[PDB]
Amino acid sequence: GPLGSRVRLDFLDQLAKFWELQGSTLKIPVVERKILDLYALSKIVASKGGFEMVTKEKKWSKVGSRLGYLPGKGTGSLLKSHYERILYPYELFQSG
């Protein structure tokens, strides 16, 4: 059972399709000349305490570092905004 990127694509399909119904069109922003994670990023946030716990403790930096970002200016700020705008709202949409 080689778990490559099958689940990743399937997940994006739901988010891209669900949002498509609204008319916003899902867009994947590029950061550091690379693709911005979503599935993994979502898990890391929860493991920290949903989201607020991450900001309160400022553990957002660890989230991006785990992905594979080089110590730059402040990618953490981009991750928070990126996650809390398209991926985050997705869950709330269903659990709202």
Side-chain angles (χ1 to χ4, degrees), residues 26-47:
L26 177 107
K27 311 222 128 97
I28 51 134
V30 188
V31 188
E32 272 289 78
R33 260 75 65 161
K34 288 185 258 264
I35 309 138
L36 208 301
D37 210 336
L38 39 114
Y39 202 69
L41 195 67
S42 191
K43 294 211 209 157
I44 306 146
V45 188
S47 76

Side-chain angles (χ1 to χ4, degrees), residues 30-94:
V30 188
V31 188
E32 272 289 78
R33 260 75 65 161
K34 288 185 258 264
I35 309 138
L36 208 301
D37 210 336
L38 39 114
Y39 202 69
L41 195 67
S42 191
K43 294 211 209 157
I44 306 146
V45 188
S47 76
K48 297 257 112 98
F51 192 110
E52 289 214 40
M53 292 240 102
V54 191
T55 319
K56 286 200 295 273
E57 287 248 42
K58 237 268 157 57
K59 315 168 148 182
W60 277 108
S61 321
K62 308 295 259 257
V63 188
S65 318
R66 277 235 288 185
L67 290 172
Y69 305 128
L70 312 141
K73 287 181 218 259
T75 310
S77 271
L78 285 83
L79 288 178
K80 246 186 99 218
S81 281
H82 273 321
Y83 180 49
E84 188 154 39
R85 267 217 180 199
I86 313 111
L87 208 56
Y88 210 55
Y90 183 58
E91 288 108 77
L92 306 173
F93 209 118
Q94 308 156 94

